[model samples]
Target chain A: TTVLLDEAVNGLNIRPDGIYIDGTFGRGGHSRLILSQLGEEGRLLAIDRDPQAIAVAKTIDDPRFSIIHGPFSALGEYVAERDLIGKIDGILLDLGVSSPQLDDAERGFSFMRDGPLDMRMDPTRGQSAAEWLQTAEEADIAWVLKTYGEERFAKRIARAIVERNREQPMTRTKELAEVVAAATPVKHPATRTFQAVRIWVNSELEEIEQALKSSLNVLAPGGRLSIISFHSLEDRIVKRFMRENSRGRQLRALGKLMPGEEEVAENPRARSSVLRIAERTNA
Target chain B: TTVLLDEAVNGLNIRPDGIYIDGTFGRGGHSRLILSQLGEEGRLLAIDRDPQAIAVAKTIDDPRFSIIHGPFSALGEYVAERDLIGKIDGILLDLGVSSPQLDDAERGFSFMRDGPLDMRMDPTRGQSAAEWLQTAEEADIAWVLKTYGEERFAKRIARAIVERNREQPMTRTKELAEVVAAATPVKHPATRTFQAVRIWVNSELEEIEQALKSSLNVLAPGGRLSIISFHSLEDRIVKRFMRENSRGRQLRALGKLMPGEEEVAENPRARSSVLRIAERTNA
Candidate 1:
């Protein structure tokens, strides 16, 4: 589901001739909504690191819209190349791995499906989870498990990974999932470890920090940064980045409120999502 | 200022014999209110790293209350030592610097006052801000200013600090404040940098993470965690921690709801303060 569909676009407070960026064009749900609102002179540039997402984004045949295949951290470069720096009306980041990636067993994002242990957002690039887990020090693995996932049994899980890896290489998603489950107490023991490994492989936190910093340079006065984050780590980075850069103006929850129970019930995946909006001041 | 005074205390949902903790007992504002709600059998363990706050707590003589002089991170040990783990009714953390600390010139918390450049919550420990600035690399300083303070002109401010210190070691609060003021456009230019440095010096974020985790361990099955944070960094940590630990239960904005306009108008400091409440579940 597109988390906070109308709320995120509405937060942009769109101007007719404005320039916009959909930093993560996941399924183009938010991008399509943004396109529906734009006037004739309005323009949008969409960017996605995932090759599949970029392929889907390329299908839209609109002169007012353009698609780029790259990480959101390079937003400044894209805006500069288009001469849209300091002229952007809004930039939206619907962060974290999208549902499509999770649903497709080939992408290896979900533990429910037994696929290769590769959980990179951009499958074409970066080290896979299996590669990292194979050689990562036990302490480092424990640190990632604890820091990113807040997993209580991090040491036990880390120890289990090392012991299991020594017997045979953990190349499949099921191998690691089984080891983590045996070590943790939670109902779905694999959840925390999966999340932690996924985040580490993608470098999600560092990307967010970089992208947010670049967004300030490209945003026009009064332009809004609308972000919908699915996890606490991403949400914390977004919230803190906005709070730090926000001047004496307001930083509000998107839709001027939260997504209600009825709305969340319709899309269970959207339940943990939080949308935060901050407008660039004239200063 | 005492922010969300009644709202924060009311969130405790006090029970007569319930054990409670006021993690940051600033001027006894929240602690005093918590005391009023307790019966003869009720118990409270108030803690503050600040010696002055402990001194203030020493003035109140009551059988139901006892104050500890230590950082909030040691909360788990305190609860465990007292054999009160899993028996606590509520935990409240009024995170960040207190008004007395801000107003007192000797404390060196305010840029408005020409005092020493010291911003430690526990003045008895940790390196002072002046000392950090003295030896820190320009890039590192800039990172702290940008990351913690969200100061837009972080690079320029860091450069200024380095340049000014080359002439003479920066020691006074006003000296650094003036240097930072020259680099930013904010009404109070040093605000962001000062906040950032203070957070780093006290390791505020790390403390909050530790304390929040411990709160979960100390609290009874249905206990409450009520937190009041003055800035986004602290509030975001609280928000995300509560969201992560919160099972299939309601997480709420406290004061029964947000404080209204009139309340904020009466106490301007309340404008930035946000209170979030979460209840423990059997799961």
Candidate 2:
């Protein structure tokens, strides 16, 4: 992994010694950079759902750094108890599953890897894809494809899966992939199915929605929250949420009308990535 | 009908005697408003795709107003042919299926009242929704949903229609509506599907994209074009198009990074409806 430290940390426009939160805290790429930029008085709180990520965060022994083994959705409740809510200077959310999640064959996030058809972001919680597939009604399966994947052949795919599952259980990832590939049109067949299964198994959209809403509650005056979305669905939600909230709120909300030129150039992942940045009222 | 005349025409700042084009002269709402504010020297060209709108335009025997029956997509070519292209002070585009189109069940823009699934802005040209649905492939249909409706359920809805069409021909609005509803989990299942079909029928998105790009060519320096869109998909395209052109060769551009407080209060739509006013440099 290229330590995407500088871009992510500097993007926050950090105030030295100010309190900050790394919502994703992925492998300390951004968190470590943030720590380096801070003074003795500064504090950093890192949170992640993955235990491996939390274990990595625990390795960095520093007076200013603290890691919480929980999801960012629980941030408001978790930080408020520590009297840190509304006082945070900045919060950076580099959302979605990190590279490790997809590369590990056991996670089953990528169709390229063959393993058990498991795809839970938090291994401790939620239903795995195999479990959901065993008994999901055609409508529910169809709903997953429609909402999560934007898949047009959802009904056909769902029907094929249902009929195939009854004759033989879909326990392995490759078996399910073969079933989906056979059902869909020859081109781009596996693409939509992979997206739907991963989204359903991990509840990715629901998590992102909550994180975005809670972000407003945490940022202080003049504080900035910069997010990077890798795909269309995530970007759409980010764009709409920011556009809706940033108006009539006395915030120095920028980019609802148009994204800045510099922002577009820095991250090519940000091509479809719409960035809506707002500064809290400096009251 | 609240014509939203001011919202559509104020891009001109109402030069009393300046020539103008009401590109979508619906019932002469904007043309009449412009005429009300014009002096004798002012001439307004009213263009409409609907013959009924032109008939209504003819009823107004004001010396300044002239109605023409044609698609405004040819605004530049037509105006230039009449020797009025660069001489015009302003142009207005009120986009989407007009209220008249939706209200007339025979025109078949709505799914509420049962009618044939024919959605054509110009009855004289283009394939109707039924024709496009007959042979459009899955990816093509998916593209229509993603591009026009920005609908996530596009794929599922498109697949359902194709499947339904195979079993029994999809001839009417209600037939397609039932298929979409059965396939979609959305409370308003007809919403995205109807939008996708209408867009396909008229090649709406493609036309609008072309119109937006072409509007820049016709928009003389200091001359403005006001466009009204009913949804985010349309509004977003308009907003981005203006932002892109408004930033062109920035040294000659006017206006601050943010709008003055007065303009925001006067036009709520102006908040989302970004008006990009450019003055031609004295080259």
Candidate 3:
């Protein structure tokens, strides 16, 4: 779902001639809206970590919009490379794994469909979940599960993974799912485990923090920083980063907005997503 | 303002016979609703550090509801004293200075009104804002203003405060407000500074973290943790704590809800307030 499409774009309060960066271009849902609002002088730089998303982004033929294949955390580098630092008008970051990634069974984000134990946001980059779990110490695995997944049975699940691996290396999504289910009491035992593994594999939280913080340097004075977060961890980072920079300013924050019931009804994922907007105080 | 009273209460998903805690019983707005939802068997224990809040709570004559005079950071102690550990059905924390505290000039929370520079939520308990600013180092004061208030001119404001204090000890709210205004560019220069100082005076963020962490121990399996926060800092803490603990659960989190347009129009403070709901998974 291109979550909160209208609200997220509106939040940027785009100027027709301004420069904007769609930090997570997820099939250009937000980028398209921004393009529609822009004039001939307007330009947009769209970025995504996932190769698939980048490939999709490559199909955009608009001369005013360009797609960069890189993690949003490298936003500073991208902006710097283009010599756009402190000149960009607005940066919109719609964070977390995209729907296409989740829908593709090969991505291994969903627990229901069987796939490789690969949970990388950018499949071409980083270590896969199966590779990590195979050699990960019981304590380390337990910590990841506990810290990222908030799984109460983290210790038990970790022990179970190790025990199961001794018999056979846990290589596929189903193998790990079964082991987690055996130790968990919940109906969908692998839900939390999957989320944790994906986050760890992609370093999702760290990337979000980095990208958000870097925005301060890249955004021009009066530039808008709008973020749409799917989960609490991402939302928390966006909320704090905006507020911390907002202090003692003309407007402390634009505050947060949750999608209306109608939007949530149209797209269930919209229910969990939140949008937060902040503007850079002129120096 | 009662402040998102209905949505907050609804988030509790009250069980008629459940044991609940209104962790910050600010004027009994939420507490009264909790009382109304309870059956003869249902019990509520409301706690607030504020003496005036306690006095208002005392006026509730229902046998099913009891008021405690203590800081909510003592939540673990309160729950332990009543033997409610792992038995509490829900905990409602409406974080931040209450409406009464903000409106009452004697409490000194509002910058618009002049009074003693006392911004403690519980006037009987902590050191007042005036007392702290009188002796606090400029660096420490700047840190507080910057970190808590996100004030951009923290150093400037801190310098002005110290310079003013050297000539005459800052005692009244307006005295400090004038000093802060001299250093700020905003229409209401004292706004962010006052918010930061008030938070520092009351240890608001620390108290929130302590109470939220304690909720896990006090709440039974399937227990609800509902919080209404009036700012980004408090809301960030609640959102992160819930998501962190929600990992590997049936319902990882209920996400956050903002007040409707009607609600915000009725009570302007409700515009910034956000409610987050989480349920503990069975261990």
Candidate 4:
């Protein structure tokens, strides 16, 4: 489900002829709304890393709207290619996993549902999770597990993966899940392992850091950054950047929002979401 | 001269039995005030990069205070050595050039004074400005000139430096100052060049970045960081770090201060100073 739908879009404070970007066009819920508010002179460039998401984005047939397949780190290049640097009115980022990717068992995001161990957002590029785990050094696996996952028994889990590989390579979700379960104390053993792998495979945090620095360069004075982050780590990146730039006199913060009781009622189990809005200042 | 002397010590919100750090013990103005407030059990460790500054610090022979010769970037190691990683109560940083350094013509900090073109705060280590200018690539010089000095004719100044070094290697401050003046377009040409070279020689910004990060790891919950910055660039570093850490829920900003009319009445032409006070949070 599109979390904070109205709240995220309204934070844009839409202008009829303004140029906008939807950094994450997952299922085009945000792109559709942003496109609906545009006039003939208005434009919305939507981007999603997944090819399938780009394939479905054909649903946005409006000439004023165009979609591309690339990660958010490509933001500066795409805008610069179009000579739109320092000319965009707003950029909206709805970060982290969406239901479409999660519900599909073939994507291998869930531990509960069995699937192939592939976990790349763009299947065409980069090593898959299964490929990384197959030959990764035990220390490397332990670092990813502990650093990204914050798992307590990350060392033991890494040791188990190396020993288990001698008997059978981890080819399936459940295969990896069992290795983690034997090492973890009481936590959802496979949960941290899978999440850490997914983040490592995609280089999620690094991309977020790069894209944030790019936003500062690409944004025009008075351009708005309306971003929605899904987890505490993501929240920390966005929050810190906003506050830093605000003090540097480059960005002026407007307000903040999060998923409230209304959102909770819609999905009883949905992860909480946060929204921060700030405008690039002339200084 | 001490800028915001009493105000800075008061901002520390001192405790009688607490431990403190004077990150920049230039002349010991702030350190003396802090030592006066501490009880028998209280301790203050003062650090200064220049050995000359350390020599004069011997005047303050109080047993409660100990002086060392090192840059602020060594904060983490100094605290770790004493096993006071999470026990420090406050750290006071009065950053930038102190009067003792600037007034001494031999240090090569002043463009108006004819001295050996050495700008390193710690003379015992690092290459001098004259040595760097004689050998550095033109592009590297231009980057330092523009990035640190914000000089408009940075390219021209850089080209001039390369051209003149071939005629006679620049071994004196006046020689480099004259070369800068010849290439720059009005507005105190030598001012920006001198400041930029001094900052580069000391690795001021990088040291500040490292020290700020170290403060987060070293300070205990409720520990205060009272920092006084002398220029806009230094202000930007401290301001942004405090704001960023505050949003990350690791630091709590208390207040800010700038040397006012009262300060101007004393020095008549002292560069303005800014002080920011923040406390480490439990989170």
Candidate 5:
């Protein structure tokens, strides 16, 4: 099941036969549940950057379920292709790398695993962590650590990586972790370094920002957007996006009373998930 | 002053002279700013379970400032003592144990620091981490992981701790970490174990939920509630509280429009730190 199975689905307050998008459909737990809730005419469009997830998606036999192997940032374009642009009822983007990615060391999202330093969510397309480390400038590397990883020892980690790469191309996950252990404060010896490499390999923050905007554009009036993010960076983006989008009056201005505290309390993930449900009044 | 200064403060939309409550005043960054913004009659009531923070609060000598040395969960009683029941203009429940608490080795909040296992936010009350480890049932400990840490290795770590405690009192941070590290999968080996111990020791989430309700009660109509939470658990509580409370016209709904794209680009923390600005129309 999705990290927030019931909350994410219920957040949609789904309508049968309504077209929906499950961007970042890791294992399709949410998409499947959404599909089960939909009517005969309801459609569920699942997207995943991970080829493996997409492969699994292809296995879903339901005619109503359509899986696309593409980055969520391209969601607007993807929706347009199906001529479903502006017709979506709701959009769900469970942001960040999935649990399975880290669980499977062969994928190398985990520093605990001594796999290749590769961290691309879509491994087939982008630069692996090792490739980026092989040549990223110290400043650029440092910036990534500081921004994406929010690493306090970003400069040292970036410098150490650069210096280590020169002696030999840094490849394995453990090697990078060692460099970070040596660079960051003794208290958090391994944190910054591990975070830096993972973020660099993924370009996570950039993608999330792009996907949020694109998804917003495709959502129909009264369409809800629920995003489940694992970190401060992801949560921050969701919070701000929701806060800003939430500003102003509802288009219909039905002066409708909003939902109550009981609903939010019952949906535990709703606490941090920040499901910014909005109606596209203008649209 | 606060890490989430403007967002939290603006989220509150403080009254120049209205009395406000900062439920967990870590360093008083928000409180100081609130004092500055308040009129001569404006009062800022800051509370913290940590005596260290209270000691620091004592240094801020202001006629309009009052710092309570107690767990924020005691907010209801403290407000009663002040004879200001339900009189607070706003409440900023910045949840989670602070950096200072974790950074100070003697406080025993950090897994990295090899100090006595005394993870008590209010050092005055409750069994310290050491005491809890000495006597807590394995099931309860596992529950801490399942509920608070959300760690997968909770059962293993809980079992290990109980086993280790029989041989030793489980009195020190390093010892606990070592045990947990040994039991955890080599990948993210320390993940769940550390999370479990800290939550159990501090009873963090329970206190947060308690403080949230108490603070919400103290908030006056039109008074804003701003909570800047570092961890997902705390933030989730804030998001749920705001969303649930803001639902159904009890509070004026803001941000009816889709979150403007520009806002997400500015500060990423805003994503996770959902600043749900709502007013109590009846207050």
Candidate 6:
């Protein structure tokens, strides 16, 4: 489920004639809510890297809305080419990997299904996780699981996979899941390992820093950037950047929000969500 | 200055016959506070890595208190060897570097001073920041500064120092300070670099996780762990551990506390401090 759906839209401080951007148009949950708030003159541009996300966003038919099939890292360049730099009224970035991707077992974003281990959001480009895992060095695999997944059992999981791969290269998601389960020290190992592989194949961590840095350049003075992060590792990247800029008075640090018990009760996936808002300030 | 001085002690739920631990005895700010409330039967064992802190601990006249001179990571071993397992009433961990350590320029914790770049809390062991920086690999150095420091201009700072050390093996605190300052695109860079170096040399980040893991075994069923962390990176380690154990009913997660505006005004260093408490549950 989408996190802080209406609250994030409300924090944008939308105006009828204003321009806005949704940095993540995943399944258009926030996008649909945002479009409902905008007036006829209010225009919106949405960005997403996942082809699945783009497919859903393209289905929307509105003159005020159009979708771009690219990561938010280049959104500033998109705004610049249109001469819309520093003119947009609000920016919304919800960095959750949408439920659609998580539920689509064929994509292998979730470890529950016995499917091909292809986790590339844009499956047409880059190495699929199955392909990468076949030849990934043990040392490099350990580092990825350690850094990206924030897993403490990285080396154990890494050793199990490399051993299994040498016997027969792992092509199926279920095969890899059991290897980690047998060797992992913790209760469940599949989720963290699966998450690390997805993040690595997509270069998701670095893109977040790049997107946040460039996104700041696109906001008009007094406009707010509403960002919600799912996990602590990604949230740290957002928090650190905001603190530095806030210290410099480059932005006004508004308060952050967490899902209430009522909200979390409705959608278990939204249990650990955090929404942080920052307003652009004059140089 | 000590952070949430009275508040942290109040959280311990002190009892006259109970045993408690102050994992940081840095000048005994919290130790003194904990001691004042204890009855003759109440006992406190403080831990610290700094020799200076150990020297201060030796001055205490009370028989009810004694200090251990080491990192908190080994405290579980300390408890088991004495067969004090599952007998601790409370655990108080204040994970600050201590004001004494920060103010003392010789330790090179604060970038405000020009001193020798030795940042060991226990300088008797391990490589100093000066010696380590002289030979650290480029990408390895970049990850510590980039990840641990959460400094975005880390690679720039990393490149500047590596090149400087190549020509002249840098030793002084001010040399590395200016090296990072020149390369960082931001307004100030010294503090982040210095902080990252101190953490890397001491292995502070990983120690927190290790300490937290075993510290759970040292406590009685109803005993509490009162931990306060200075920054978000370190704070996440505490949060993630608490969340997992709570989900499994291994502990009951208590609500956290934040320093008030008045507290922050009095002690500027307490600005971003967070206090999280957890009570261990029955099997």
| Best prediction by DockQ | 3
TM-score between model 4 and native: 0.51
The candidate, 5 or 6, that scores higher on lDDT is 6
Question: Chain B vs. true chain B: TM-score for each candidate?
Answer: 0.93, 0.84, 0.96, 0.96, 0.87, 0.96
lDDT of 2 by residue, B222-247 (tens): 56566666556676666666656646
- Model 3 Cα lDDT, one tens digit per residue, A165-188: 878997778888888998877558
Give the per-residue Cα lDDT of candidate 6 at A84: 92
Where does candidate 4 chain B have its weakest 10-residue lDDT segment? B255-264
The CAPRI class of candidate 2 is incorrect
Per residue, candidate 1 scores C-alpha lDDT tens digits across B143-223 of 998889888889999999998888899888998888888766656778888999998888898999999988877888667
> How displaced is residue B280 in candidate 3, in Å?
0.7
lDDT of 6 at A135: 89
Ten-residue stretch with the least lDDT total in model 3 chain B: B254-263
Better-scoring candidate (DockQ), 4 or 6: 6
Model 6 lDDT tens row, A181-202: 8887544678889889888998
Task: Report per-candidate DockQ.
Answer: 0.02, 0.01, 0.03, 0.01, 0.02, 0.02
C-alpha positional error of residue A170 in candidate 3 after TM-score superposition, expressed in Å: 35
What is the lDDT for B61 in model 4?
A: 78
Q: Native-contact fraction for each model?
A: 0.00, 0.00, 0.00, 0.00, 0.00, 0.00
What is the i-RMS of every prediction? 10.9, 14.1, 9.4, 16.0, 12.7, 10.7
Off by over 4 Å in 1: A1-3, A247-256, B1-251, B254-283
Better of 1 and 3 by DockQ: 3
- Which 10-residue window of candidate 1 chain B scores lowest in summed lDDT? B252-261
Worst 10 residues of 3 chain A by lDDT: A250-259
> Against the true structure, what is every candidate's RMSD?
15.4, 20.8, 12.0, 15.4, 26.8, 16.1
> Candidate 1 docking category?
incorrect
Candidate 5 residue-pair clash tally: 29
- Say which prediction, candidate 3 or candidate 5, comes out ahead on lDDT: 3
**Per-residue CA lDDT of candidate 4, range B194-275, in tens?**
9999999999998898999999998877888888887889889998998899884888775454443334457654345776
Selected candidate, larger TM-score, 2 vs 4: 4
Residue clash pairs of candidate 4:
none
Regions more than 4 Å wrong, model 3: A1-283, B1-3, B249-251
